[PDB]
Amino acid sequence: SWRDKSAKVQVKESELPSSIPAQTGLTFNIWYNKWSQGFAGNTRFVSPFALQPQLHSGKTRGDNDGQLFFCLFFAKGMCCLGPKCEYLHHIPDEEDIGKLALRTEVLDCFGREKFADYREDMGGIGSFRKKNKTLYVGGIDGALNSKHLKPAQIESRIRFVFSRLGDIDRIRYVESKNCGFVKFKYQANAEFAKEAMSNQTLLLPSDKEWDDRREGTGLLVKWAN
Ligand code: NA
Ligand SMILES: [Zn+2]
């Protein structure tokens, strides 16, 4: 269990761009976009950083301070703080989901304002965004490095990878569209998995293609419409 462990340092401060910002505001986006734009090319880069749920998860300062929000850097495999982090470094489970559902309505599992293209009538947040638990997952073939897997094996692969970030409700893979849909049982996991799987490979250390995973293209993960 993560509860008996201290969160591991994922990266050294020096492996990251200078001026590491807070995770809650739009400065994170500016910072992350600048980093994202340093990867040359028209196509989505495969991130050099990845969350390893079993290896990385553990207690942080947040667990002692009664923090409810998870670390955005942790989700992306980009946290240098480890046990020093004020935010949670584990996969959101029932306890966390329960706590979050009582504390806030307007903020996601990372403590960022939930964004919708529209607001409700006086005037919370967009109703569809509010209840959405389903992620659009695009560019599957690129994230596998064009590894030849059958549609059913691709479903199994997506299920296996996303299942490590929360309980799965439903998986659909559409071959003709090179895309899938991952519905989580809980929104918090969908929010977490969205940030965790952006620009990620679908390959596993068990594949012979694993070492060449950055030759492919990173996953596109968005909310489904
Ligand atoms: Na800010
Ligand atoms: Zn952290």
Curated annotation (Swiss-Prot):
Protein's cellular compartments: Nucleus
Annotated Gene Ontology cellular component terms: Prp19 complex; U2-type catalytic step 1 spliceosome; U2-type catalytic step 2 spliceosome
Alphabetical keyword list: Cell cycle, Metal-binding, mRNA processing, mRNA splicing, Nucleus, Phosphoprotein, RNA-binding, Spliceosome, Zinc, Zinc-finger
GO biological process, one term: positive regulation of RNA splicing
Zinc finger (C3H1-type): 65-92
Purpose: Involved in the first step of pre-mRNA splicing. Required for cell growth and cell cycle control. Plays a role in the levels of the U1, U4, U5 and U6 snRNAs and the maintenance of the U4/U6 snRNA complex. May provide the link between the 'nineteen complex' NTC spliceosome protein complex and the spliceosome through the U6 snRNA. Associates predominantly with U6 snRNAs in assembled active spliceosomes. Binds directly to the internal stem-loop (ISL) domain of the U6 snRNA and to the pre-mRNA intron near the 5' splice site during the activation and catalytic phases of the spliceosome cycle.
More about this protein: Present with 2650 molecules/cell in log phase SD medium.
Protein name: Pre-mRNA-splicing factor CWC2
